[PDB]
Paper text:
RSV F is a class I fusion protein that is expressed as an inactive precursor, F0, which is cleaved at two sites by a furin-like protease, leading to the formation of the disulfide-linked F2 (N-terminal) and F1 (C-terminal) subunits, which associate and trimerize to form the mature prefusion F protein6. The isolated antigen-recognition domains of these unusual antibodies are known as single-domain antibodies (VHHs). Here, we present the isolation and characterization of two llama-derived VHHs that potently neutralize RSV A and B subtypes and selectively bind prefusion F with picomolar affinity. Structural studies reveal that these two VHHs bind to a conserved quaternary epitope composed of two F protomers.
F-VHH-4 and -L66 both have a cysteine residue at position 100c in the CDR3 and at position 50 in the CDR2. A disulfide bond between the CDR3 and a residue at position 33 or 50 is a hallmark of VHHs and helps to stabilize the extended CDR3 loop conformation.
Author numbering: 1 to 52, 52A, 53 to 82, 82A, 82B, 82C, 83 to 100, 100A, ...
Write the structure that this text describes.
């Protein structure tokens, strides 16, 4: 039942912006925490943005804090990651993940229960 489907990947120029969407099915945002993760080529997968489905409270790691913002639309059951001022080092597959807020334990890859299949973002150079 619980599934996530990311979309919006494509080629961006450096300094450009891109918004990714994560469509939730099998659940509603209110009971969960939604996270965005990324894997740049050769690199370990790392957290990027978490959001609370109910309150909309957010968590941003140092590397993207300021440039990346996550938002959620309860009515559309969708979580969005806005990326501003993109850098070539942001090239990665961006994954959506979620966990029931009852089990919420921080914005870490080992604390997620369901994973999307990813969507590739490439910042040309």
């Amino acid at each position: 039942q619980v599934q996530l489907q990311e979309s919006g990947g494509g080629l961006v120029q450096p300094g450009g912006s891109l918004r990714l969407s994560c469509a939730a099915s099998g659940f509603t945002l209110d009971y969960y925490y939604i996270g965005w993760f990324r894997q740049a080529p050769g690199k370990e997968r790392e957290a990027v943005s978490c959001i609370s489905g109910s309150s909309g409270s957010t968590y941003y790691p140092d590397s993207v804090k300021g440039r990346f913002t996550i938002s959620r639309d309860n009515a559309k059951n969708t979580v969005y990651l806005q990326m501003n001022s993109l850098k070539p080092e942001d090239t990665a597959v961006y994954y959506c993940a979620t966990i029931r807020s009852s089990s919420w334990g921080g914005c870490v890859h080992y604390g997620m229960d369901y994973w999307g299949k990813g969507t590739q973002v490439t910042v040309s150079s």
